Amino acid sequence: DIVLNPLGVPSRMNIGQILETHLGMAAKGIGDKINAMLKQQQEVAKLREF
Amino acid sequence: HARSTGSYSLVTQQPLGGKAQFGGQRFGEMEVWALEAYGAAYTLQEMLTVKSDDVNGRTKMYKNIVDGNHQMEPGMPESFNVLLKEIRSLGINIELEDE
Amino acid sequence: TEEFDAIKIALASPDMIRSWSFGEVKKPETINYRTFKPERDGLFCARIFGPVKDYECLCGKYKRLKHRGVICEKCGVEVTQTKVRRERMGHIELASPTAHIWFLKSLPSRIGLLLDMPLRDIERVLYFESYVVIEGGMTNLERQQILTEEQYLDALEEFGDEFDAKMGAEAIQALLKSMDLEQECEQLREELNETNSETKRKKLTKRIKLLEAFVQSGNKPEWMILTVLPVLPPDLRPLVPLDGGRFATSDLNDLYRRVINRNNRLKRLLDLAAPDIIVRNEKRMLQEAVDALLDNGRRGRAITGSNKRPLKSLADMIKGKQGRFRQNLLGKRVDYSGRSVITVGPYLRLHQCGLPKKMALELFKPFIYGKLELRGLATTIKAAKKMVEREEAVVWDILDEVIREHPVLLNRAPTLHRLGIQAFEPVLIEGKAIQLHPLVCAAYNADFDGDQMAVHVPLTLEAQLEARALMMSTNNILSPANGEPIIVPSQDVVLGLYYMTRDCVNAKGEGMVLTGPKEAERLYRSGLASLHARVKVRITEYEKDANGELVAKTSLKDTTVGRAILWMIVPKGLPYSIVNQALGKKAISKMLNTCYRILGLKPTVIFADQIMYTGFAYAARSGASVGIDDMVIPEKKHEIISEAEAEVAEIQEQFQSGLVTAGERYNKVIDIWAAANDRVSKAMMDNLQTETVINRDGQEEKQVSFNSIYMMADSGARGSAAQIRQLAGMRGLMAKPDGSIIETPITANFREGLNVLQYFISTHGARKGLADTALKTANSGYLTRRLVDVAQDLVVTEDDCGTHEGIMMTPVIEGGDVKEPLRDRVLGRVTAEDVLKPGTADILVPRNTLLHEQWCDLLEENSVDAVKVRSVVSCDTDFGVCAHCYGRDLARGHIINKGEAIGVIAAQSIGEPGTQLTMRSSIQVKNKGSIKLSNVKSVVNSSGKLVITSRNTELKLIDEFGRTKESYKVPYGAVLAKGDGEQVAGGETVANWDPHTMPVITEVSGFVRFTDMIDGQTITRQTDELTGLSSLVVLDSAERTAGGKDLRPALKIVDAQGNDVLIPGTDMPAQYFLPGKAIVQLEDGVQISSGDTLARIPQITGGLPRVADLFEARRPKEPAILAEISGIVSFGKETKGKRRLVITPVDGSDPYEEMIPKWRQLNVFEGERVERGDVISDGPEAPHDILRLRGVHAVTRYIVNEVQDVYRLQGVKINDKHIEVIVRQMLRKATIVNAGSSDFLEGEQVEYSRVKIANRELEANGKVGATYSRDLLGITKASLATESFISAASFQETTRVLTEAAVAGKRDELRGLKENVIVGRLIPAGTGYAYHQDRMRRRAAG
Amino acid sequence: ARVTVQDAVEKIGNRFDLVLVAARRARQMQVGGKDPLVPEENDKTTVIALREIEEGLINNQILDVRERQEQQEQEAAELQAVTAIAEGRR
DNA sequence: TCGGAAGAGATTCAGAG
RNA sequence: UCCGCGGCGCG
DNA sequence: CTCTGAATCTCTTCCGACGCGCCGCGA
């Protein structure tokens, strides 16, 4: 959706933001999986344990 | 924001400032030095006299541009007359010479 | 209009001002509210100032132009245009005089010093506090005697009506009208020639010249006291309506009304015969009111309104940054302009900017009206307006037709240097963002985080021709500050090229052979080989042959696929070797520069555009990106930090045992932490920078890593070793707000989390830096304004002045390091003298040759060590500089054209980098060479060493070709282990000295005998019971007895017979005095060898302030004293704190005496033969004295050296020319030592041009010419010193310069740039220059 | 369109003199209406004058002699007109 | 109706008579 | 159609 | 022991970026 220039990061030393990006990819990851786990309409106990 | 022409101020006869008044940008003194660094005299003269402050020269310019002739006629910046009147009112006599 | 030639200024005679006015205003009324009509005789009385409306009589008698130019009978209003309201001035007439506050309060009281009166007395009379006296011969009371009230009554009750006494206004008016000018002139000059006191002499001279100015202007001095006061026209002081029917009154109207009210009150109290004290109080109030009107706040408490703010008087309308001069005369607002947020557009060619359609329509609406009527689509302006406001698409077609070749100007505030304004040929885009080409955006200093930019459209065709020829970005490739190109890529472009040219040891398709770069491109795009793969390729290149033809060559070369791809765009003529390496930013910069020198402008422009396109495309295809795994942390770091903390614990416990002082404990801890931090940084760089990968044959091999952040740093695209060090290595020490370093460094890097303490202490530096830049911006802007004001007059006015004078250029070397090679310092300058091939008499380079790159290369080949070049400071041109003295224009590459304004270029070139500046015992040879002594006298001893009596000698290490390599200053009396001319090698000790003492050297062997000394009076008998052996110490003037005062302790050397040996070369005995508090190791009567010593002696600021002080000609606080005369130093009388030194000339009959302080260490021992300009005592250096002693070249070299030193320390490059020009501008004022047969008075300040011309004509008719000395006034004073009083009034201290010009009767010819900019005619520079030449010929014809 | 004028500046030497000459040439081309000496290609009088001076067909002295001959033609027309008026009177 | 630098004026100290 | 003063705000 | 000049001290004045944008208020 949005393309950012990487060259700014080392010179501004906003390393933390890169970490934020990684967490984002992780977060939606779980969402995606749980979304699919909901879409297949399986037993709620499985998603509960997940 | 952009202004071809519009209102004009009372005392200085210069164009108004700011977006709300639909005024023009300010050709600050740094820009004047920039022009002086080039040999670009004519555009400087046009910037000061006709586009800005000549109460009749800009009318003539508007006429000629509408007519499609890019002539120019530099009069005198009215702010200069304002400065002269204020200096005279101060009690110091100042006047032009070799008319 | 009026075609005036000059402007004249003088005092206002009351009859003159009354002649101006079309009527008197006598009542305070302003405007009726029943009907919005002025009151008669009021501040807006139409009967005086004319009608409020065009040809409309106040009474309504007449309404149209049929009666144009007639006066209504019912009232005195005239049937005319409203414009007259702007013109006509009123007048008011006072029942009493009033001192004009300017002439009183100005820093020298012009009236006061004219009448020699103290300002306290003048104010005490003018403010109605005391009487003053005018004398009659029957009374002892003299004239101008101050008179208090009790003295007034005492005098009047015995001598009433015999003398006369008056209050300030009338008394001063009568006194000024009751004095003659010539009698006081002659008495003042006779007193001047008879008196001696320099204070008295300077006061007398300034009075003499003031009286001369008054007589030559013919202005009657009493006019300084007003009697009739002008009234500013109503329109300049408008009364403006408000919401609810209210009106904002301009403060000037209120001040006028107050003065009118006080005048009316005084006149009423006079005409009804009020008592004395009442009318005195009223007239004092009236005087105070006039003071408020002119210059409220100039004296005492300022007047204020209901808002509790001081009202802006007339003077405030011209003073200050809100003043009329700065706000409106310069820096006008302009029509036909727009502003918008900028945006990257990569698809643009170099010379075209993307301009939103709406702005284009608005700006060119007049042109659209014009063309639309011309093509017959619209008949009347109303039709055109309604059509364009409906956007009938034909208007869009017309709009696309109009702008096709119509350049526009783009400007970014602040316009730090002239690149800040550039010209572009527009292209129309939907949207609302102005699109720039990134390359020029780099030059703009702009970014894209939200910076706005303003666009102006030129109107006339001459203007747009100027914009195309001069300003178009395709012309501004070379910066004016230096010859290197300004159009240089950065960020993604450089990253892409770097990736494209980097090779790897093993890649897809390695080793194959390509018949041409096209096949390389095919194999890459088809995906059968990666860019990095190394391959052999057949390539053709070309070279500019001896005739100028591009002779071809074709060969096989080893390269990379990426390198061939890049080569394919390279234009013909450049060698292939330029590409065949990992291209960084600097490589691309030099590639563009070599393209521009080898080929023309247009191939370079096309090359730049192609570079930008290809770099962007291949960077995008690269997909370089930064990830958290990239910032590898060297695993050694934990071990190194544990080691460092172990050492910290060790030193801390060592202090716990009391073995060391706390300060050295701190120092040791700081040192070990710094060492550990450096070790960690080295480990991090080593681990990151290189990595191991398998080769083609199946073995591991090292290569430069493709780690992303490292690739970004190494390419030079962005970042630096410091930022990488902080990202991965430990970031190290940080400073407390006082600048002291915290003992515990920040150990965690940025990748790991910083604890709260580390973060908090780190914030100190962050807020320090932000405040630093916030403050620095203002100082930089101010400094630039100054430099511009000083240098704005200077314009190239002739081709060649014919001066053989010049300056000597040598490479700048300090401490054995060549800080600046000769090629940079001499490139583009004209030879003042013919350069000879070294070691021969053959002419290598002829005189008056512009040294371009080939000449510089030739100089390097022959190893020329010094050149002589023409300089701006040495040019003989009057009111300008010749083209040959200035030399090569950085922006164009050839000799500068006539008519260019250079001073402004120099001022901006100095100012712009200022934003970057910061603001809050033995000698070892470094390398091979030969030892030479610059200026030395040496004596050799029984130890085989050499000891020196020159106090300012320097070793210089010389190349075998005669070029210098190293140079180092050597202190007095240092010991040397080598003779002159010996060979040296790196690390070789050649000389030694004790820095902690000052020795005294005896040149000849003999037997010491104490002379002119007595123990306990001049010297005391130290026996160091607490230190060691016996010694003798000279008793200081506070410790010595009176018998020790005239007796100066000394030792003579005697032969074996006890006879006093003479100095080997002079009639002076070999006598060596012991200075105050001197220490000697040897007792009376011992032998000492030749060249042996016996004496023991007890022994930074920010860049921007330093440059400010240099250009302001600041006197340093501890000025070193240098020999004003060539002679022999000699001692003499003594007094408190100061020693009466004397220099006695060798042949001259005129000794000189100086009050040298004793607390400064003297470098003189009563035997030092000295010459003019030689250092007598060290310290900071005063530029004025340097100029006096060693001339213009010395001071210009000093200034340029200091400024270049600070800038090079920052790393910015500025050519010397821009400093030399400022120096020449500083150096205008001269002073006259004898007039010869000229009319000039002695001691007068005269502009150097005037005195030069006068002397030249005076000798042209054979008379004795005048003689002069030149004075280095600071740039502020030098700018105020100019004759163009208009420019001075524009700059600073407006009231002072206005008063000075007024009393002087000055006239300004309007010859500089600023004056013409004010007036609005063409400037006498650039394209305007030609217009003036014809004019001056007509003025010569007139 | 014109990427750069540098060749024309090389021909005239002084850049500012180039601006003046091109200005007067464009002035007379626009109001005087005298036709370009070279093909126009929907360009503007400015770049037209720049190309013309680039070709060396137009230069300060060339303008001088053209103005001289135009003045001579105008004065010849004036003299022939007044002679015709005199012949009408006679 | 706030600190710094420069200039001018005033006061004090040293040298010479 | 307007002189500002104060305030934040972005360069 | 006194007078004048020079030096030092005290007091007053000047300066301390360019550009846009909104809000309030206005005896």
Ligand SMILES: [Mg+2]
């Ligand atoms: Mg920005």
Ligand SMILES: [Zn+2]
């Ligand atoms: Zn009337």
Ligand SMILES: [Zn+2]
């Ligand atoms: Zn010269």
